[PDB]
Coordinates of C-alpha atoms in Angstrom, one line a residue:
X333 CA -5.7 -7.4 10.9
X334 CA -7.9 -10.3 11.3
X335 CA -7.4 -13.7 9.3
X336 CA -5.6 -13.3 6.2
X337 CA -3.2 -10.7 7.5
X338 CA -0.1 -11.9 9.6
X339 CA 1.0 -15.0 7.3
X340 CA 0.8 -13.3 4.1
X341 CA 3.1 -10.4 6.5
X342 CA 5.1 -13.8 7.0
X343 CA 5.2 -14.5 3.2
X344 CA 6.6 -10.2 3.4
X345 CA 8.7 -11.9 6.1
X346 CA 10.6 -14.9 3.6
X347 CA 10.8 -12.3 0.6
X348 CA 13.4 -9.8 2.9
X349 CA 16.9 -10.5 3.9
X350 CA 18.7 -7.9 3.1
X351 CA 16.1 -5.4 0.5
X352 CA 16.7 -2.6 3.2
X353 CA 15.5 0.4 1.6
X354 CA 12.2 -0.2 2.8
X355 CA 9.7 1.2 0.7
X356 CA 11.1 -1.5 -1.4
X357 CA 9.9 -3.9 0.8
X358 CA 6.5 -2.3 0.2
X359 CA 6.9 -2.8 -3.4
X360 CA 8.5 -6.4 -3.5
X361 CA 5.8 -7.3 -1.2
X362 CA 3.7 -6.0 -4.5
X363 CA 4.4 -8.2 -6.4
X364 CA 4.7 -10.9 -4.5
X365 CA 1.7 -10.3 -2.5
X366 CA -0.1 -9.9 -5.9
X367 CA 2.0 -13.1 -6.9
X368 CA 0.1 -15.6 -4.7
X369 CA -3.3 -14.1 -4.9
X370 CA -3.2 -14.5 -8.4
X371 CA -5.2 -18.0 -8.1
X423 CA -21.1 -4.2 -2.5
X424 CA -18.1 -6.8 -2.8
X425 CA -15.9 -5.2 -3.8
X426 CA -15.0 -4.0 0.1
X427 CA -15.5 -6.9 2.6
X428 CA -12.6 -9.1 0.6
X429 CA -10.1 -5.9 1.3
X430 CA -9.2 -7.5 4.9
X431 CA -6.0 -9.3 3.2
X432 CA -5.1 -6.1 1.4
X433 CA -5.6 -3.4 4.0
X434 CA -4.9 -5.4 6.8
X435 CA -2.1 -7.3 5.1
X436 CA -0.4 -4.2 3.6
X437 CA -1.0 -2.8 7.4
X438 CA 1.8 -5.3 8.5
X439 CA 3.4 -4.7 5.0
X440 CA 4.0 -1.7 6.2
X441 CA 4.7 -2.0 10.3
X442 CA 7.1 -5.1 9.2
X443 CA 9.3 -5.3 10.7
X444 CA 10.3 -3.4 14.1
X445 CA 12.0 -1.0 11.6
X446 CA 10.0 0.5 9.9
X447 CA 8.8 3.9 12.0
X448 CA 11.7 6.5 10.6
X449 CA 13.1 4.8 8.1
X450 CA 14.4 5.5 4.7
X451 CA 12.1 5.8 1.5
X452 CA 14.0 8.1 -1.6
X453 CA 13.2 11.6 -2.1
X454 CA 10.8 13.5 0.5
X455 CA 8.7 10.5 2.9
X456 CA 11.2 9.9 5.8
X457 CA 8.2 8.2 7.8
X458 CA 6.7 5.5 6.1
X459 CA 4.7 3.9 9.3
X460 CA 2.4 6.3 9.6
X461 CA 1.0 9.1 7.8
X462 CA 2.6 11.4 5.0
X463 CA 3.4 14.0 6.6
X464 CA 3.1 16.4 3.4
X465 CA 0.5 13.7 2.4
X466 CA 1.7 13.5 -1.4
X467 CA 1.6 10.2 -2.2
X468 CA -2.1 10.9 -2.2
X469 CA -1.7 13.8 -4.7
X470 CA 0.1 11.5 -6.7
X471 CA -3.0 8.9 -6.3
X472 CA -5.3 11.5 -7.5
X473 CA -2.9 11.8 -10.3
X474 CA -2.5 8.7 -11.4
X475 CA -5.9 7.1 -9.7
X476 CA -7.9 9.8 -10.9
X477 CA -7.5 9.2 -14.9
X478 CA -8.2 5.6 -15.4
X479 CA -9.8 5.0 -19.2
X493 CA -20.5 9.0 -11.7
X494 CA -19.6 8.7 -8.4
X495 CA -16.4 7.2 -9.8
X496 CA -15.5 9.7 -11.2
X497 CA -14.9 11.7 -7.7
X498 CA -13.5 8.4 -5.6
X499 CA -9.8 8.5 -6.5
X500 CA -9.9 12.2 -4.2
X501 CA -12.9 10.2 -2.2
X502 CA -10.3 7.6 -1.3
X503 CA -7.4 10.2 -1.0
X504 CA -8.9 12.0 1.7
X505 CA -10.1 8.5 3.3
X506 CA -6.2 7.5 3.0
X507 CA -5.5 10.5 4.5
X508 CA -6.0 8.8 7.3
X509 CA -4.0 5.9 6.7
X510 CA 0.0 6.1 6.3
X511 CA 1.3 6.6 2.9
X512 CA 3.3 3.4 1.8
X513 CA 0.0 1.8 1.7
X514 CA -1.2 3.8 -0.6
X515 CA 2.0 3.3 -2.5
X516 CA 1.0 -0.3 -3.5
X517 CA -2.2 0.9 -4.1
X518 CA -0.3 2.8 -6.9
X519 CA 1.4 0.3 -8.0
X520 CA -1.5 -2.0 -8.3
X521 CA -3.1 0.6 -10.4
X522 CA 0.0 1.0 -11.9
X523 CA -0.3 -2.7 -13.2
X524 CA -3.5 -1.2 -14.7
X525 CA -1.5 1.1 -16.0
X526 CA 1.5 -0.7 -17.7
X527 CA -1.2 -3.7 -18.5
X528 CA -1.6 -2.3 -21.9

């Protein structure tokens, strides 16, 4: 939560007025987040997105208990049922040797993150999806 994390949570901050369904918050700050970054390293540039989408998704003061559709009612921290990782296995997992275990690798490593976070993850990938 280091350097490139608060202000882009501000840019999170001047996107919302009223979007109050907030998992919609999570997937405005999508793409929006993906809209001004458009200008082993992989990992070590993922401060702005973990970190960043950590305050995506403790932004703002609401956001323990709050409303998401269908089953998550707690979007700050963990899944409860942990689905949203069955659906990133899902949808993670089919992308077209150790690469082709990570989408479960990372679900069990998100597993220990909350879920919303992984929900722009999906929709990220889901860009990689709808790319074509």
């Amino acid at each position: 939560l280091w350097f490139i994390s608060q202000p882009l949570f501000k840019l999170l901050k001047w996107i919302h007025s009223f979007v109050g369904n907030w998992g919609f918050s999570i997937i405005i700050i999508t793409f929006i987040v993906r809209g001004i970054m458009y200008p082993c390293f992989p990992l070590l540039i993922q401060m702005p997105i973990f970190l960043a989408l950590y305050y995506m998704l403790m932004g703002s003061v609401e956001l323990r208990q709050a409303p998401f559709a269908l089953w998550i009612h707690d979007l700050s921290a963990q899944d409860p049922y942990y689905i949203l990782p069955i659906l990133m296995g899902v949808t993670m997992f089919f992308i077209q040797k150790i690469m082709t275990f990570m989408p479960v690798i990372f679900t069990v490593f998100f597993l220990w993150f909350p879920s919303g976070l992984v929900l722009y993850y999906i929709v990220s990938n889901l860009v990689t999806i709808i790319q074509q």
